[PDB]
Design an enzyme around this catalytic site. Structure first.
Site, PDB file in Angstrom:
ATOM      1  N   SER H  15       0.783  -1.242   0.000  1.00  0.00           N
ATOM      2  CA  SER H  15       0.000   0.000   0.000  1.00  0.00           C
ATOM      3  C   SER H  15       0.803   1.272   0.000  1.00  0.00           C
ATOM      4  CB  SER H  15      -0.923   0.049   1.217  1.00  0.00           C
ATOM      5  OG  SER H  15      -0.162  -0.033   2.417  1.00  0.00           O
ATOM      6  N   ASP H 191      -1.237   4.573  12.637  1.00  0.00           N
ATOM      7  CA  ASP H 191      -1.012   3.122  12.770  1.00  0.00           C
ATOM      8  C   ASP H 191       0.463   2.663  12.720  1.00  0.00           C
ATOM      9  OD1 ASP H 191      -0.353   3.283  10.125  1.00  0.00           O
ATOM     10  OD2 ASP H 191      -2.041   2.093   9.408  1.00  0.00           O
ATOM     11  N   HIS H 194       1.189   3.738   7.822  1.00  0.00           N
ATOM     12  CA  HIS H 194       0.631   4.580   6.713  1.00  0.00           C
ATOM     13  C   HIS H 194       0.850   6.047   7.098  1.00  0.00           C
ATOM     14  CE1 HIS H 194      -1.494   0.769   6.067  1.00  0.00           C
ATOM     15  NE2 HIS H 194      -1.030   1.005   4.864  1.00  0.00           N
TER      16      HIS H 194
HETATM   17 CL   LIG Z   1      -0.365  -2.646   2.719  1.00  0.00          CL
END
Ligand SMILES: [Cl-]
Ligand SMILES: [Cl-]
Ligand SMILES: [Cl-]
Ligand SMILES: [Cl-]
Ligand SMILES: [Cl-]
Ligand SMILES: [Cl-]
Ligand SMILES: [Cl-]
Ligand SMILES: [Cl-]
EC number: 3.1.1.72
Lengths: 219, 219, 219, 219, 219, 219, 219, 219
Positions: H15, H191, H194
């Site tokens: 991500s 978190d 991110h």
């Molecule tokens: Cl991820």
């Protein structure tokens, strides 16, 4: 780095500055700063000068001319008690002359633009540590294209004003012109105004260079 | 009127032709034609020649170059058994060279463009009653702007192919150029490609004039 | 061309005029003019007379009768300082008599309609260069269908009023009747009122013809 | 009551029958039946004959002609093993001739309509306990309106096929015609096809009367 | 038929009456009447007595008790100048005692219910041609289920009041009880209150029977 | 605690078990388990036995009967290689007999239910470490209500199969019955099947008690 | 069980308490209580003590500090006339010091926190039967992590206050710490604050234990 | 600048790399690159090296471990014929061990991680001009936090593989660690994985420095 620790830096202007920022306060986070040059500036400042603790507010509003900035100046600038104010305005003041050429009262011509922007700087200057005047721009390499040619007149006024008022100064047109020696405008901005991430980086870098940012710090 | 009663007229092209038409079928009277020049053409023909009984199909697809047209030509054109085929392609063929200059596979250069369009016209011509070749266009009045200069070159190819194949020809660039003596591009199209209602009317009128439309029928 | 350079042309009426236009100002662009005959008129005027610089406002509101136009006339017409006012009203005044035949106060009968429309013209006339009265219409070829027969009574009143007040005049029913010699109403409008793009072109052309528009200009 | 206990009753047709029913299964009690005459029929049967234990399936599909019915007859009718099949088709068969007059392939003319519907009835009849043939209709009181005149012709075919095959028959046109002595079409259906709740009740009542429904059961 | 020509019939109550009707006016059409028994009543009245020209308003509001009806009576009933008022209330007055048994102020017990409903009838009666009192109901066949047993007490009060005030009277519980000899409640209403289309037809038929509706009229 | 460290526990059933779980995988900690008793069970085990390291999978599917369980048993149970399988099925098997009484193919009667569930348990048992059989339930305190009476019968089958196969057993009906001495069903579940948080807690607690959960661990 | 029959228990705090509860009243049902520890508490109380008839209100608001609770105390607590008030606040008071470390006025430091929370307890105490003070928490096992270390200071203040004012007391950090001997924080809460269902169960159980809840009741 | 003109640079990862990029193609200039470090890298290269003519592809996929990279390596990397491949993987490989500790199949432990990543690098290296290996990272300043300690181990593997294969190397952990001397993790990423715009800038800057980017080009 011109900006000192704990200071408040406020950006105002049109959609290029706004870039979807949170209304009305344009602070508290990044979503709140929008997704263009303002956010990139703040990101880079935090990445390289995290200890500065600079507070950044975004008061851009899409569609604004300098006439619109004046109408909201007290609430959106003065009342915010900034230490540094960055202004980038003039794109709409000029654009309206070319996209609505028969609605002339939506147009802000160069002498009204000059006096109005001057008035904002003079009002603000006693209240802040510094002002940064960014020129408007038009992403178009032909100096003789009518809108480019008008935009450049406005940018020369900005530079005039910065000199006379001892404001900091970012020639955004100059920064784009260099890239336009290689890229046709379409590759940066399909409407010659609203740029890609690359164009926002062009802007952010030009602003950071003027405030003394260092990409790798020396002390 | 070059188009005669009972005939099926099929328009193909890119977003300018598409304009949100219904997929896959693209026909007929109640929104399937989209909201640009094709619908206007069909509207005016119906208003002024309701008895012609013309059926109209919109096979425009946003994004397409002439390479894309070739790839779906069998299903979207030949298999529709049209009587008349109007083609307007080249805007993306050219624009990708300017907005994505380093993605060369997306570009359709003049050799591929001429050979492909020539081949599509030659193959289609004996299967149908007639072909209308519309030039691509760029809403930009400076002949020396690089993308306008390339677009004009692509238009020459279209003109030369129409002459060689005895196709009808619509010079859409000339139609815009007339209005551009008065208006800057921004008044017609912010990106110099996707026009207002007024631009779609410029196009529709240029198409209609070429097929012998009369605004008020003489007899 | 009756309309002169720099002048403001204001359209009012019901949903046929509104066609999803931007509220409240109905100007600033085309999305703002909606997607029916008003937009088409403006498109064609800009395509053929771009130098005119005509400003166009759309004050249509869906559902309106002439009783509704009067209730908003001061704000939506007088206060706009138009040079030309186009009025098309009467569809609802009549429709209510047939779709809600037992809610008779929603009905505007012919003598109230006549005096009210007369009152609007007489009030406005001293303030503007010109008025264009468009008849209501009903897309139905049988003169003896009850709603068609009523609509025609209203259209005759409109024509009366235009003659007496020296207003310009567009018989929209006459323009539809011609097309209805070929097409059954369903092909133009499923509810016999709200037309396809073709019906909007019928209307736009009829209006343009009355103001002296030329499809190809002679000087 | 012609329908008897424990039987499965399957309705097929176009949007009038569909009315938003659940696809593909179309059954049973809690919204799967849609919101028009079929649901009303099922409602009233349950209110007045709850002990009949009738199961009901709605296989209506918006847009369908009798050609479309033939194409899905095996899966949507025969494979459901119904006891009773009610058919109401012809509205689109006819309407396409009027709303898309030049798209002739969309039309189902009287020869195709008679042959197809006859064939579907003949094939189904020995597989089921009974068939109910409902005419199409058009909510239009002038017998000489062209679409009403054609619709009445299609209805005669339905009546003749029902007589020949000893099917039950519902003349839906006659049911509307009775109300049209009082109301103009616009009070029941703006497009003359898709009615209000009141029109769906006209239909449901006409269906129920034919199958021997009693509002208050005599014994 | 108790209701005369041109008269206004107003329905009030809770969600069973509301059934998603348009707020605030609950008239002008069917979407406005919602999709339950009120709409069905109006549909059937228009289907069978179209010449009556009865105006129907729906003032149901979901969640209401009789205490809520009183709080809005002046605006939602008196001010509407109805000729006939139908009231169906009591489901919530009772339901709250069973779903929120420890929030007792949300409960309307039988003596407050009786006096309040009595007060509404007595206030209204001099102002209207007639009142129709519909009992509440609970779709549950066991008379000894606690909520059913309470509901029946409330329905007996309704019947008391109708007798004493010469109001018309619909025992909705009796109409459901008959169907409940065959169907378990789940088949009509999963929560024993909000019914299927069938349950709404049970209600509509019971109301129509009390006002003298004929399914096939005799003169 | 019957479940031991490192084991995989798989819950299967209908909507009561599903409660919006992630499909197809149904695991693990962050919402994939849904929002009812299964998530609560997993929550409490983690709060009180975090060291057990239990993995949990939710294979509940809204609507399912035991026939549906058989059809997906290989992919959703055996192929997951669980250590423990908890089954709660029968609510729909029964409910369809009551809410769709005439759609007999949707019903799973006692013979199909016993044979199927028996077969699934017998086949699964040697593949896994243990099985927990939870009865279906109906939130209804009257043993003589017909659906409650049938549900209790289905529960006896579950109890008998668990005894015969030495499965763990949770009598979910008994757990509700205890609370139903105080509350009417409407306070726990409006449809007598889908409960509030409090009902899901009744279920979770009944499950936990059977597997030897302690609220406060003794040693 | 400290809480008596018919009493009103009100929970206030930040997002952990709010967990999407209905604004403004946070009662009338569970959706209204949100989907975290408050709902679980109420579920378990209703499952095990249904006869208590405890009324529960949720006044949590996401983002709140103790400074925010004070600003709304009169309306959201005093005016509600609770019998028992549970307070859990301090997460934000601390979090702001670490996520916005240069916006120090958003920070509530420990001496302001202490006096403010003290002020709320002292004001409220004469008006209610009891107060339950829950510590804030931080899901982080390292006592020396800066935010954990600060949180613990705040929790010690809470415990101080509860002792001095004879309030009930829930050490939520202690309850988490036990589970954190096994699980890394990520398994409970990705941001170390907002927990999984398991974390909400940790909280609910800790609260229930302090008010004397029994998982299986002894009399 | 290690990257040279005309080359294709392909970024792959999880991500952090994805950041909402366009699937499947992931290129080029107008939003397809997503909104994190990859877009920033491409922005800055264009602002400062517009003439390099670099093409950039984003093949990041949210959720991926190195096992997932292997499974799509042929289609998403080799078949794209890149000149340069940048890899940033390991965050999920590690994080699953901590957030889903009992779902061991989701974990990619150090042996699988080293062998897989080694194999992907060895196979790719002779097919391309160069490889850039970026470490995973965790925004956590305590080296003894268990997930940070594991992440640092995975980073050593990346460093060792880059040295062995003469790949470029970016130590993303070291770049965060520098800022973490000033800021607690919550100021950069709630978190710890991110990040904000500022974290993406930390990453972009670390990437750029390794490829020889200059903020202001010296010659
Ligand atoms: Cl991820
Ligand atoms: Cl702007
Ligand atoms: Cl396009
Ligand atoms: Cl209208
Ligand atoms: Cl249809
Ligand atoms: Cl209700
Ligand atoms: Cl279910
Ligand atoms: Cl919060």
């Amino acid at each position: 780095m011109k900006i000192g620790s704990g200071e408040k830096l406020l950006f105002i202007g049109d959609s290029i500055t706004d870039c979807g920022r949170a209304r009305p306060e344009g602070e508290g986070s990044f979503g709140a700063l929008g997704t263009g040059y303002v956010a990139y500036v703040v990101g880079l400042l935090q990445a390289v000068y995290p200890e500065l603790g600079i507070r950044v507010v975004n008061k851009g509003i899409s569609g604004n001319t300098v006439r619109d900035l004046k109408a909201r100046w007290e609430e959106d600038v003065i009342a915010q008690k900034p230490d540094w104010v960055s202004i980038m305005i003039g794109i709409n003041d000029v654009w309206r002359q070319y996209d609505l050429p028969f609605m002339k009262e939506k147009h802000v011509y160069l002498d009204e633009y000059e006096a109005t922007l001057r008035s904002l700087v003079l009002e603000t200057k006693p209240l802040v540590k510094g002002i940064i005047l960014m020129t408007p721009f038009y992403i178009e390499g032909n100096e003789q294209d009518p809108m480019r040619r008008t935009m450049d007149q406005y940018g020369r006024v900005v530079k005039q004003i910065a000199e006379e008022t001892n404001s900091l100064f970012v020639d955004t047109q100059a920064a784009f012109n260099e890239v336009l020696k290689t890229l046709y405008p379409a590759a940066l901005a399909i409407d010659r105004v609203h740029p890609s991430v690359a164009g926002h980086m062009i802007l952010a870098r030009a602003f950071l260079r003027e405030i003394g940012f260092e990409w790798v710090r020396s002390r």
